[PDB]
Symmetry: C3
Subunit: 200 residues, 3 copies
């Protein structure tokens, strides 16, 4: 029994930076209509918090992104977040997450970073920034030598990258914000498309 | 009030490996004539020290590069250096730098490395080796999630890379040695050119 | 006097994942016939152990790869391994290796990782995953600022990459499994070829 089961099932994790006019509930529905029931609200704006609050009942597995301290981590959880994400590994955020019994996906890049995370009992890791660092080819090398790690790649991933990611066996989901630009029929399309480019 | 103000103003930081026949004072003048008042002398040769001594009165903001230990760091400062640079983060060099109240730009690459530096109160970071690691695309991802960090990219950067770097908002200066190959009218040209390719 | 002298002499280090039907002694002979007297058996399968046992008398400098804990490290050594390799740096594996007086080549990628290894007295380092991370261009930047480190690049390296690696001055050997796919006359060819593409 997996707490990231929803995540594993989408294979897809949109990220959202709130500018404050978004139709959140609208978005929520489209996402869940399309087979994608997780979403990540970045805390790069205080409105990211208000948006977790607003989406609490939405039925989405909600993630909090850019969580950069134990306090920001606590705040996210009290806002409705079910999992935490940060760009690099914060041991103190992992201590908060294990304390509250919620999943924490620290970002990693190097094999050494992978061991360090593993050493904290974390085996579901962000890979960030994925595109500049050659996500697909890197996660292919980690499939062999880290057979126990699942990865959440994010960072500059475009649609055309998807079929390459879909062939990897150590893939938890692919993250991005690219999915979410446009209007509700726009976003739906992109989601439906990325959903299809993964598992063909 | 910024101790790296000169650096921010050039946007450009040449690096120099002394082979011992260079016209340092000549070079100094050309640099300052061209809007570029900082320069980095690498300590890959003992003559790097003699060159800091020689350039002490030049009016250049002088940096010491490849500083790989607290002692090498002290020596650089007694030679006339106003800021220290190393290829990776050395906590003990940061302790020497905070002790002497001078700027230290540790090299970083990964998000995790970025946090670790930040945790030492360092928010002006080397990004090295920039070109192999896709400097521009990486620093673009860090602009969003590390909005408080300024970066000094160095390592294999060529002229043609500049206009891409110039559009980033988290750029302290671009470093390189490529600027400094040739003769005084040669170097001047390259400096004038890189100076122009940045901010268009 | 160098314990990795054989390694330095091949310039080439095949890696082998045992599926359990291989002609090990056959392979051994071909390797040593071809100027290549080191070989790396990955511990991604328990049969990797049986293969170290089987090759103990072969006259090969045998390495153990994917060693991810002090215990796995001990086991490898009792199986006949003369050197240890892991994808990232494990301090506890380095303590086992220094205890038993055998070489340990932790994998590294970043300048900071390089210092950390150096700080443990390790100056022969794996560079992994080499190809996604632009091995050649990265090891070229490290040649200047880490003039004391020799590197063992591995990870997605193909034949055509070799002449670029061969020009670097800080190269201990290039690792890969690509060398070992096929049949004994097949493998021989690939070895003879990679051996030649290095030092021309």
């Amino acid at each position: 029994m997996d707490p990231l089961a929803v995540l594993a099932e989408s294979r897809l994790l949109p990220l959202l930076t709130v500018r404050g006019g978004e139709d959140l509930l609208g978005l929520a529905r489209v996402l869940e209509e399309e087979g994608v029931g997780a979403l990540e609200i970045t805390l790069r704006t205080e409105k990211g918090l208000e948006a977790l609050k607003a989406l609490r009942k939405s039925g989405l597995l909600l993630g909090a992104g850019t969580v950069r301290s134990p306090k920001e981590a606590e705040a996210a959880l009290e806002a409705g977040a079910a999992f935490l994400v940060s760009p690099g590994l914060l041991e103190e955020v992992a201590a908060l997450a294990q304390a509250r019994g919620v999943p924490y996906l620290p970002g990693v890049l190097t094999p050494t970073e992978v061991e360090r995370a593993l050493a904290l009992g974390l085996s579901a890791l962000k890979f960030f920034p994925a595109e500049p660092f050659q996500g697909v080819r890197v996660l292919r090398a980690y499939a062999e030598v880290f057979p126990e790690v699942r990865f959440l790649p994010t960072g500059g991933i475009k649609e055309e990258h998807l079929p390459h990611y879909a062939a990897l066996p150590n893939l938890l989901a692919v993250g991005g914000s690219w999915l979410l630009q446009g209007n509700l029929e726009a976003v739906r399309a992109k989601v439906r498309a990325a959903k299809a480019l993964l598992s063909p």
